[PDB]
Scaffold this active site. Structure first.
Site, PDB file in Angstrom:
ATOM      1  N   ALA A  11       0.829  -1.185   0.000  1.00 50.41           N
ATOM      2  CA  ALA A  11       0.000   0.000   0.000  1.00 50.41           C
ATOM      3  C   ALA A  11       0.878   1.255   0.000  1.00 50.41           C
ATOM      4  O   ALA A  11       2.045   1.246   0.408  1.00 50.41           O
ATOM      5  CB  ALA A  11      -0.930  -0.059   1.188  1.00 50.41           C
ATOM      6  N   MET A  13       1.426   5.242   1.299  1.00 54.08           N
ATOM      7  CA  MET A  13       1.231   6.056   2.452  1.00 54.08           C
ATOM      8  C   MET A  13       1.560   7.521   2.159  1.00 54.08           C
ATOM      9  O   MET A  13       2.694   7.797   1.707  1.00 54.08           O
ATOM     10  CB  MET A  13       2.099   5.546   3.620  1.00 54.08           C
ATOM     11  N   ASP A  44      -2.606  11.188  11.871  1.00 62.54           N
ATOM     12  CA  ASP A  44      -1.972  10.381  12.914  1.00 62.54           C
ATOM     13  C   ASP A  44      -2.720  10.570  14.227  1.00 62.54           C
ATOM     14  O   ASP A  44      -2.852  11.684  14.720  1.00 62.54           O
ATOM     15  CB  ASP A  44      -0.501  10.801  13.115  1.00 62.54           C
ATOM     16  N   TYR A  49      -4.317   9.788  23.207  1.00 64.55           N
ATOM     17  CA  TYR A  49      -4.501  11.224  23.011  1.00 64.55           C
ATOM     18  C   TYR A  49      -5.869  11.711  23.443  1.00 64.55           C
ATOM     19  O   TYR A  49      -6.075  12.917  23.592  1.00 64.55           O
ATOM     20  CB  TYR A  49      -4.228  11.642  21.540  1.00 64.55           C
ATOM     21  N   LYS A  78      -2.671   3.804  17.227  1.00 67.03           N
ATOM     22  CA  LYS A  78      -1.664   3.174  18.010  1.00 67.03           C
ATOM     23  C   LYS A  78      -2.269   2.487  19.227  1.00 67.03           C
ATOM     24  O   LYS A  78      -3.144   3.064  19.893  1.00 67.03           O
ATOM     25  CB  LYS A  78      -0.576   4.147  18.479  1.00 67.03           C
ATOM     26  N   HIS A 111       2.433   1.479  20.184  1.00 63.58           N
ATOM     27  CA  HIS A 111       2.759   2.897  20.464  1.00 63.58           C
ATOM     28  C   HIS A 111       4.141   3.054  21.099  1.00 63.58           C
ATOM     29  O   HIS A 111       4.910   3.935  20.724  1.00 63.58           O
ATOM     30  CB  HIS A 111       1.647   3.525  21.301  1.00 63.58           C
TER      31      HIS A 111
END
Ligand SMILES: NC(=O)c1ccc[n+]([C@@H]2O[C@H](COP(=O)([O-])OP(=O)(O)OC[C@H]3O[C@@H](n4cnc5c(N)ncnc54)[C@H](OP(=O)(O)O)[C@@H]3O)[C@@H](O)[C@H]2O)c1
Ligand SMILES: O=C(O)COc1cc(F)ccc1C(=S)NCc1ccc(Br)cc1F
Ligand SMILES: [Br-]
EC number: 1.1.1.21
Length: 312
Positions: A11, A13, A44, A49, A78, A111
Site C-alpha cells: 500500500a 502512504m 496520525d 490522546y 496506536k 505505540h
C-alpha cells in the site's frame, strides 16, 4: 516530489500527515476538517490522546460530504501500553475504530515497546512512582498485531519508539508473518536519528518522523529549551527559499524518504504546513540541517525508565 511512499505491505502512504497529540477536543474536529479540505490525506491518531472521537467526527463528515473517498485516506492509530495483552489487543483496536468511525485502519502501531499493567489508568504507578510493567513481551504483542491484519481490522501494522535492537527482535521473530511496515520515531534537526533511520530503511521499514517542529507545546517544555522554530540558522535557510521555518522543518524529513506528521490546530498553519511540495532543499541545506544534531529528545519519560523495554 511524489506525495506517497510505498510500504512493504504493498500500500501507499502519504508522506505528509496531520498530528493530533495535544489537539484540544473542542478544536480538533475543525482542524481535521480543514486539513482534509486543504489536501491532507493522512491523520496520525492514538487512543492515549483522548480525542479520537472528535477526530472521527471530522473524518466521517468529510466522507459523508464526499470531499474524499475512504480509499484516499490513510488513518493511523496506536495500541496503548496498557493493552499489551493477548486478550486486550483486538478490543483496543476496535475501540479506536469505533471512535474514529472506521471499519479499518490503514496502519496500527505498537505505540511504545513497553507494556504496562492493564486497567483504567494509562500510566499505572507503584507507590514510589515507577510505572507498573506487564510481563508481556514485544514478540507476543506483535503476534496479536498480526491477527488484526488477518481479521481485516487493519491494513498494515508497525511499531513506534522501537530502538535498533527492538526492531531487530521483531525482524528475527520466530514464525514472523508480517514485517513491520513503519517505525514512527522522534526526528528533527536536534535529533537526526541517522543510525536508526539507516537500519530501518535498509530493512524496508518506512520511518515516520514525529515532533518534527520540536513539539513546542509539549507539556514539559521549559523556557530555556532549544527551539527549532526560533533557530536563526534554520530561519536563514527558510528565508533563502522564501518559505517559513516550519515549512523547512517539514520538507527536511520528506527529502530523507521519511513520512512526517506535524501537528497544528491553527487553520492557517495547517494550510501553510501543507505547502511543501513545490520547493527543494539542496544537498548542502540537508547536510547543514543534519549538522544541528544534539541528541536532544523531547519525548521521554522518567517514570518509565526502569521498564525492561524502555527504548532510550
Ligand atoms: N508515536 C509517538 O510516541 C509520538 C510522540 C509524539 C508525537 N507523535 C505524533 O506526532 C505529532 C507531531 O508531534 P508533536 O505534536 O509532538 O509536535 P510538532 O508537530 O513538532 O509541533 C506542534 C506544535 O507546533 C506548532 N506549529 C505547527 N505548525 C506551526 C507553524 N507553521 N508555525 C509555528 N508553529 C507551528 C503547533 O501549534 P498550534 O497547534 O497551536 O498551531 C504546536 O504547538 C503528534 O501530534 C502526534 O500525532 C507521536
Ligand atoms: O507518547 C506519545 O505519543 C506522546 O506523549 C504522550 C502522549 C499522551 F497522550 C500521554 C503521555 C505521553 C507521554 S508522557 N509519552 C512519553 C512516553 C510514554 C511511554 C513510554 Br514507555 C515512554 C515515554 F517516553
Ligand atoms: Br516505553
Amino acid at each position: 516530489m511524489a506525495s506517497r511512499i510505498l510500504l512493504n505491505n504493498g500500500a501507499k502512504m502519504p508522506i505528509l500527515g496531520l498530528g493530533t497529540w495535544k489537539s484540544p477536543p473542542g478544536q480538533v474536529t475543525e482542524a481535521v476538517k480543514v486539513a482534509i479540505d486543504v489536501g491532507y490525506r493522512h491523520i496520525d491518531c492514538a487512543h492515549v490522546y483522548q480525542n479520537e472521537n472528535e477526530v472521527g467526527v471530522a473524518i466521517q463528515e468529510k466522507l459523508r460530504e464526499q470531499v474524499v473517498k475512504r480509499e484516499e485516506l490513510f488513518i493511523v492509530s496506536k495500541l496503548w501500553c496498557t493493552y499489551h495483552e493477548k486478550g486486550l489487543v483486538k478490543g483496543a483496536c476496535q475501540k479506536t475504530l469505533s471512535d474514529l468511525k472506521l471499519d479499518y485502519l490503514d496502519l496500527y502501531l505498537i505505540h511504545w515497546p513497553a507494556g504496562f499493567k492493564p486497567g483504567k489508568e494509562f500510566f499505572p504507578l507503584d507507590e514510589s512512582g515507577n510505572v507498573v510493567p506487564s510481563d508481556t513481551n514485544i514478540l507476543d504483542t506483535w503476534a496479536a498485531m498480526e491477527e488484526l491484519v488477518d481479521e481485516g481490522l487493519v491494513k498494515a501494522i508497525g511499531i513506534s519508539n522501537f530502538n535498533h535492537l527492538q526492531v531487530e527482535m521483531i525482524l528475527n521473530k520466530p514464525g514472523l508473518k508480517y514485517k513491520p511496515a513503519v517505525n514512527q520515531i522522534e526526528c528533527h534537526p536536534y535529533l537526526t536519528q541517522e543510525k536508526l533511520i539507516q537500519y530501518c530503511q535498509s530493512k524496508g521499514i518506512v520511518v515516520t518522523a514525529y515532533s518534527p517542529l520540536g513539539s513546542p507545546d509539549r507539556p514539559w517544555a521549559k523556557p530555556e529549551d532549544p527551539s527549532l522554530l526560533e533557530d536563526p540558522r534554520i530561519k536563514a535557510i527558510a528565508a533563502k527559499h522564501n518559505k517559513t521555518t516550519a515549512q523547512v522543518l517539514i520538507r527536511f524529513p520528506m527529502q530523507r524518504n521519511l513520512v512526517v506528521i506535524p501537528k497544528s490546530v491553527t487553520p492557517e498553519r495547517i494550510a501553510e504546513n501543507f505547502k511543501v511540495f513545490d520547493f527543494e532543499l539542496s544537498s548542502q541545506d540537508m547536510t547543514t540541517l543534519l549538522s544541528y544534531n544534539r541528541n536532544w529528545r523531547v519525548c521521554a519519560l522518567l517514570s518509565c525508565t526502569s521498564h525492561k523495554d524502555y527504548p532510550f
